[PDB]
Amino acid sequence: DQICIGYHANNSTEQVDTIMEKNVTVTHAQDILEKTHNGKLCDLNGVKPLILKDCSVAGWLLGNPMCDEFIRVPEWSYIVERANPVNDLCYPGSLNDYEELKHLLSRINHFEKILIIPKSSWPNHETSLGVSAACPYQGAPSFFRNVVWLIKKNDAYPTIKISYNNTNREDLLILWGIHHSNNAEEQINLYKNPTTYISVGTSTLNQRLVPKIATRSQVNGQRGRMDFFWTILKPDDAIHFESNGNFIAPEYAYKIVKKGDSTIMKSGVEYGNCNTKCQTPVGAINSSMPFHNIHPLTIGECPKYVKSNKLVLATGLRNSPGLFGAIAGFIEGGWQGMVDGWYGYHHSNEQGSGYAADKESTQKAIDGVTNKVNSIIDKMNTQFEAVGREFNNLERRIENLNKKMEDGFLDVWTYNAELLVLMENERTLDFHDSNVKNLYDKVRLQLRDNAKELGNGCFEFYHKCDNECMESVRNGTYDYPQYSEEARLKRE
Amino acid sequence: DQICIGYHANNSTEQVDTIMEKNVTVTHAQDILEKTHNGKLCDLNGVKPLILKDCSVAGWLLGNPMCDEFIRVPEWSYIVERANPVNDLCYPGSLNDYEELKHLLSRINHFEKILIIPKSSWPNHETSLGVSAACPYQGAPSFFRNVVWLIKKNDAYPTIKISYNNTNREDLLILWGIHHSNNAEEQINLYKNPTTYISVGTSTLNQRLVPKIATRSQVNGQRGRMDFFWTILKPDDAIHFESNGNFIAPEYAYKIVKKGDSTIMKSGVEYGNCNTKCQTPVGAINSSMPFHNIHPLTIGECPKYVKSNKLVLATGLRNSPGLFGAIAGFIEGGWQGMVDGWYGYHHSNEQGSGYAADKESTQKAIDGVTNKVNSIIDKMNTQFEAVGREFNNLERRIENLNKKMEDGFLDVWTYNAELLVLMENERTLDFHDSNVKNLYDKVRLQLRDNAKELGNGCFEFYHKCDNECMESVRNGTYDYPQYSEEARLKRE
Amino acid sequence: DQICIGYHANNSTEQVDTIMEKNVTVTHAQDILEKTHNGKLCDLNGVKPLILKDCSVAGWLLGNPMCDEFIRVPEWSYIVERANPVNDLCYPGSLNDYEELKHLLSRINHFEKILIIPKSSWPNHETSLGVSAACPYQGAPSFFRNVVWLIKKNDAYPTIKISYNNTNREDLLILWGIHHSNNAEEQINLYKNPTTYISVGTSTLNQRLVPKIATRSQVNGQRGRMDFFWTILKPDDAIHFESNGNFIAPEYAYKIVKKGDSTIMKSGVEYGNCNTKCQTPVGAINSSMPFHNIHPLTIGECPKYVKSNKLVLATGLRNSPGLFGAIAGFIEGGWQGMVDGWYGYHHSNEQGSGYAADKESTQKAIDGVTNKVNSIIDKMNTQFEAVGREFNNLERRIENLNKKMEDGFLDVWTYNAELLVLMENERTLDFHDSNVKNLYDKVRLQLRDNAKELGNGCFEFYDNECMESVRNGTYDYPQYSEEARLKRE
Ligand SMILES: *[C@@H]1O[C@H](CO)[C@@H](O[C@@H]2O[C@H](CO)[C@@H](O)[C@H](O)[C@H]2NC(C)=O)[C@H](O)[C@H]1NC(C)=O
Ligand SMILES: *[C@@H]1O[C@H](CO)[C@@H](O)[C@H](O)[C@H]1NC(C)=O
Ligand SMILES: *[C@@H]1O[C@H](CO)[C@@H](O)[C@H](O)[C@H]1NC(C)=O
Ligand SMILES: *[C@@H]1O[C@H](CO)[C@@H](O)[C@H](O)[C@H]1NC(C)=O
Ligand SMILES: *[C@@H]1O[C@H](CO)[C@@H](O)[C@H](O)[C@H]1NC(C)=O
Ligand SMILES: *[C@@H]1O[C@H](CO)[C@@H](O)[C@H](O)[C@H]1NC(C)=O
Numbered sequence A, B: 001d002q003i004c005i006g007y008h009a010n011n012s013t014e015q016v017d018t019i020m021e022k023n024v025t026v027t028h029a030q031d032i033l034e035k036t037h038n039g040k041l042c043d044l045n046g047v048k049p050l051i052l053k054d055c056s057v058a059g060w061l062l063g064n065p066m067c068d069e070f071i072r073v074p075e076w077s078y079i080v081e082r083a084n085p086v087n088d089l090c091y092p093g094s095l096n097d098y099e100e101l102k103h104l105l106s107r108i109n110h111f112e113k114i115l116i117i118p119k120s121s122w123p124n125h126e127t128s129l130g131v132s133a134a135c136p137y138q139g140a141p142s143f144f145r146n147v148v149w150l151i152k153k154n155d156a157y158p159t160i161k162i163s164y165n166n167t168n169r170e171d172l173l174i175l176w177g178i179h180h181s182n183n184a185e186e187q188i189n190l191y192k193n194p195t196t197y198i199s200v201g202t203s204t205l206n207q208r209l210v211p212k213i214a215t216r217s218q219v220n221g222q223r224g225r226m227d228f229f230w231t232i233l234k235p236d237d238a239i240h241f242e243s244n245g246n247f248i249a250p251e252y253a254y255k256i257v258k259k260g261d262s263t264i265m266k267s268g269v270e271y272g273n274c275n276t277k278c279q280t281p282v283g284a285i286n287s288s289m290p291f292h293n294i295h296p297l298t299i300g301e302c303p304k305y306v307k308s309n310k311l312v313l314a315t316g317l318r319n320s321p322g323l324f325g326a327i328a329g330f331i332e333g334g335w336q337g338m339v340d341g342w343y344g345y346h347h348s349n350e351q352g353s354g355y356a357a358d359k360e361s362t363q364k365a366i367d368g369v370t371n372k373v374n375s376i377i378d379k380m381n382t383q384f385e386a387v388g389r390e391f392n393n394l395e396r397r398i399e400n401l402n403k404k405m406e407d408g409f410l411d412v413w414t415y416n417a418e419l420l421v422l423m424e425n426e427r428t429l430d431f432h433d434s435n436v437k438n439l440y441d442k443v444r445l446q447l448r449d450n451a452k453e454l455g456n457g458c459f460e461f462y463h464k465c466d467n468e469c470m471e472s473v474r475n476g477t478y479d480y481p482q483y484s485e486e487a488r489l490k491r492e
Numbered sequence C: 001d002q003i004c005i006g007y008h009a010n011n012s013t014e015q016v017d018t019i020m021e022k023n024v025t026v027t028h029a030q031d032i033l034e035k036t037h038n039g040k041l042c043d044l045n046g047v048k049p050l051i052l053k054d055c056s057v058a059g060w061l062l063g064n065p066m067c068d069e070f071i072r073v074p075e076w077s078y079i080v081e082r083a084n085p086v087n088d089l090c091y092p093g094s095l096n097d098y099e100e101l102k103h104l105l106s107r108i109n110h111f112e113k114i115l116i117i118p119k120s121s122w123p124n125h126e127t128s129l130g131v132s133a134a135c136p137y138q139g140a141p142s143f144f145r146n147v148v149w150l151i152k153k154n155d156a157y158p159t160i161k162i163s164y165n166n167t168n169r170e171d172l173l174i175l176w177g178i179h180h181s182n183n184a185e186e187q188i189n190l191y192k193n194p195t196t197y198i199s200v201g202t203s204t205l206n207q208r209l210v211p212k213i214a215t216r217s218q219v220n221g222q223r224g225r226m227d228f229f230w231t232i233l234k235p236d237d238a239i240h241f242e243s244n245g246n247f248i249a250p251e252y253a254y255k256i257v258k259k260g261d262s263t264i265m266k267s268g269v270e271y272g273n274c275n276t277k278c279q280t281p282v283g284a285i286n287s288s289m290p291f292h293n294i295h296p297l298t299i300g301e302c303p304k305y306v307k308s309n310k311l312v313l314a315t316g317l318r319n320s321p322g323l324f325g326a327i328a329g330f331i332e333g334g335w336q337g338m339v340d341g342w343y344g345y346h347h348s349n350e351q352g353s354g355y356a357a358d359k360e361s362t363q364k365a366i367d368g369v370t371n372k373v374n375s376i377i378d379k380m381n382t383q384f385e386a387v388g389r390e391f392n393n394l395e396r397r398i399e400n401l402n403k404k405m406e407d408g409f410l411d412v413w414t415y416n417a418e419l420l421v422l423m424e425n426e427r428t429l430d431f432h433d434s435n436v437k438n439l440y441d442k443v444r445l446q447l448r449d450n451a452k453e454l455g456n457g458c459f460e461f462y463d464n465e466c467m468e469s470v471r472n473g474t475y476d477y478p479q480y481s482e483e484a485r486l487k488r489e
């Protein structure tokens, strides 16, 4: 007639790691690293992204003739751009502050293209000969669709003086440019006047552009360049243009109608006719898990990115095939027969045997391990969220600074995650070692010298303990005096 | 007849948090988070700040006629500037490298405005007509007080050639400007010479300014603009000016007399006629706590900023209404009667009863807990300290980079603060748990079978233990031989 | 007639720190901080550094005469620049995007200087009169040697139109310059043409340069300025020059042969004809230690920089001059006569008295301790590595951002390293305490009433073979129980 203290054991093969030991099999565990993605680009909460295909942001905004799919773009969630889009700036040149404009586009979800300066507004200039083979459309030379390349009419280029007032309540993105000719003859053939200028002015802008007539290398079949510029015209402000040649005048402008969360994603992955709440350049994430290792740059409701390969929290006890010396100590193994709890008793009397779990000790441990898991997840709610930022060829130091800043915070938070899991896993296992010892000691305090301590977690009753007597030991109501006289005689 | 082992209990309602349990009431606790401020701006160690009111740094340095309170500024501890100062640049334009100049002002505590080029030095130019209604002073057109707007004299603007040599043995801040006229008629009306230039040359500076005569929008009633520029003239270096129009000559220069710790604070709160050692834009801090959650940007000897709402370190033990089985284990509760220490004894004999504390074990716990608290404070002595950095409209990428860097370190150090407190509170509670068990076991080894283990932390003496016998147990000097026979006789 | 439970003690003076206690003397400990360097500049994995001596990068690239001739410079592991090079630009001026060029050079391991434009290509201009006293060689006026200062010939400076095509298939670094004259007379005496320009054009460059003739302060005895510019000519691309005066024309250019990890180190300590895998400006480091405190800026496979002055991990026991009550508890002191392991027994019996160690208990402690130390060595490899980034006087906001960022990451990883050692040192000392206690209880349950629990860690039994058997885990309680009742009273 004996009663024993024991703990749970199942067929689990899951393994966690600690600072002192690796690959420790446990009865229950919780993974906290999501590792899978659908490998496709999807809608973000029902909103389809804007995929520019092989068109760049500059080609879409300036109106590259090969980017005509994007003339009435619907509202977008994020913008997908291939790393090297081919339909960018058909006529060679540049877009000034292109990276700063992309930063502004990252906070915009929708444009509304509006005609600001019609071609009927240039009666004494030619509007149809600003066309080049570098910008082909359907076999014929064309040009950017949103701006107009003005050239001389009747061998004369009168000084232009035009102003547009943003009578709209929304901010206006306006683009214009200057044409760099190649020689003194081409300058005359296109704009009679030899020495030319462009003056652009607003409340804030005070810009004067002068063409650089020099010999340059051939790009896209053209030795000339076209430098473009942009500005944000505030409501009830006006832009004032003055030029006597080489003026690439605005025709359409973009009304910033929707501002919100967006990003310019560099990706060649395909749209998969799907929806998601979390999107990465490599694919979309579908998980309730607190961490992921897919990609640092994410958008939407996303888990926090880490560089880990495995991250599993220990929630149960060390499974059987010790700071407190109970689990894998004087109790050498767990019981597969005890299924209703983590800790409990095995009784053996003449009426039979059976397993019984101590619900109070088990529920206290369940509440503790649940609070620890919940505490660790909430402690990582505020992590570093990497953002995409673009820099040019002469901004390498700043680009390198942005790389080390985002990578440095990643290694810091990756280390914080793996070390907190490593440390708290050791604590969780030793927390189970306590509750078993405290359960063994609680039974030991109740039985006293009425039973014998075998040393394996079992108590050999000196008296006779039936099923009701067995339950009273588990109850906490074992009556020592009721059986003291029989135990006294049983000794020798 | 009986001696017991127990622990302290009091009326404290202070609560600490652990990883496995929150809102744990403890006997003693130390708050380490300051959450209060006086809500006013004060002097820093007896030095009053420079409060520019509605004037900007540009308006103060250039000499906006509406900023005449600051023509002689005393040495300041920090600079206070409202978010959107009204006065600023009375005549529309810009101050080149404005944010870079504000970065140099943050390392400067005092200027000495000195007159470097008098209006006497301009014999063949008009020095008293360069005024505008955009810069009114007591109902009459005026201009920036530190520069002179030179215009033509006798319908002639001879080419200016002037040089100033820094003989003041300290660095000198010099400001000058260029005026952008609106048309060829206004250009001639003010300067006669139609094509103008400004050449500024030092040992490192080689600048050429040319007016941009164009059509702009009206700002402060003026369609013209005025672009200002600055340099730091090192001692024994000379600045060379040359211009034939549109030149805004320096009159007064700022002499850097004292350099030290300062900051350009952005706040709308008012001066409170107070002194402090720590100042934030929302208020001043008078505290000895190691942490605060007032504002990230502080100046002076300050606590370390965290984003925590509560940060309480557990110093005592779980208060009564663990890993080791003592506190809230076989010892059910604490003793409100023990007030001399954390752990001790309760004796009950024929002479009477009494509460006594174990000085040795209590002092050992006090020293460890005190060293712990001091260790947690010391490891946070080197934290990230945010600094104010300004950026213009075309530095959004870097400004966003700066915000993410400073916010990322705040989240990292906040995480370290709450997690270290969360983990060490758990350890502190088990530390008290073990010390009670180690004290109960120490008496257990002394008495052996001379007393009966009650199981609740009390020992029922088989023999008679008087007041000095009870003291021998607390001393650790209990003579088991002297009473072996009586205890054996009392056992039947 | 007794066997006892005890732990190791020795003569160790090594100290560790915990959060609750400082200067704790331990039996065994492992230092994990490197604090020594050779104080020399050495080769990195067999490759000698490029030491520019008293010369700047710009002086070497442009061809300062007082600088070394720097011909056929071999492949370098890293570049060494004095903090304030005394040569730099002999003729006063500037080099556009100098810091961005040095960033590019930090990612380049070999240059090959090639002659791109011969002086034979200037028939109508003077190619030998562009010298100044500000650029002296042999006490005679000279100039930068990778660039030519073209001067008028026969009171004439005809407009120049020249092009060079990059046929090499490696990227090319080309430098040109402009002279800012002092007075209109000087302009004519040197170039005749009064209004001058320089036009430079490539596939990506569209530059126009007009001289600024003005009065300046004199530097190196010259009031004129020589402003230099650079570009990277991609393969099968051409650079096109056009100027009617004030043109400092390219003569030699630098071909990018190898692009790899390198750095511009700001050091003045001497080359020591040594080899290392880790170099700092103060000296080189040879160490397997996971941390170092020599200098933040390092090149090669290096330990991780921390601002700590001491970092010692506790691998052994609290030495005799806890959460569990064994060490410094009911066992008051350790055994110096016990040299075989951390835990074990001392026996007193018929055959003699003997100290023996429990190898199974010690090995479990050794295995866990080494696993902890190795787990602390790792999880530290992915730290922050500081890079040298340069900024000019009007980029001070960004320089402060860079400095605060690099110092912030150092302070974070310093806090992480010290707090990890403090916390795990304490857990180690308690791990030993539990190990001893569990050993004491393993024999306690075994012997039962066949021995008396003395309370000092010793058991008073009521032979060598039996003594070893209890240490094995075997004991026949029936075989030895009877004498005990008689031995009692
Ligand atoms: C663009 O048009 C608006 C609206 O006409 C001008 O803003 C003011 O609007 C009021 C309407 O009552 C007019 O009476 C004012 O004459 C206009 N402007 C003021 C005081 O600024 C606006 O100025 C025009 N914008 C520009 C740059 O010319
Ligand atoms: C473990 O047992 C469950 C049934 O209780 C079974 O569904 C599962 O397949 C088993 N898992 C393994 C790894 O054997
Ligand atoms: C732990 O398990 C993984 C496979 O699950 C194995 O690759 C690794 O070698 C194991 N490490 C140890 C220390 O057992
Ligand atoms: C055990 O506990 C239940 C209530 O939880 C009680 O009804 C029952 O009488 C107890 N039985 C014994 C043998 O103590
Ligand atoms: C708790 O006891 C202390 C001791 O006097 C006293 O200062 C305090 O007011 C008491 N608090 C309450 C709620 O009784
Ligand atoms: C802890 O105490 C605070 C203050 O009374 C209370 O707001 C909060 O609900 C409590 N939290 C828990 C888990 O009981």
Ligand SMILES: *[C@@H]1O[C@H](CO)[C@@H](O)[C@H](O)[C@H]1NC(C)=O
Residues within 6 Å of the ligand: B165, B166, B167, B236, B237, B238, C217, C218
């Ligand atoms: C300024 O004055 C000192 C002495 O009068 C002189 O040595 C120095 O050259 C002057 N500085 C310049 C740039 O001329």
Ligand SMILES: *[C@@H]1O[C@H](CO)[C@@H](O)[C@H](O)[C@H]1NC(C)=O
Residues within 6 Å of the ligand: C015, C022, C023
């Ligand atoms: C620890 O020991 C060293 C060497 O004896 C000594 O320099 C140092 O002051 C000690 N630290 C403390 C806190 O006593």
Ligand SMILES: *[C@@H]1O[C@H](CO)[C@@H](O)[C@H](O)[C@H]1NC(C)=O
Residues within 6 Å of the ligand: A217, A218, C165, C166, C167, C236, C237, C238
């Ligand atoms: C350089 O030479 C190659 C070979 O003829 C030619 O293809 C290339 O176009 C040339 N580069 C330029 C810019 O002309």
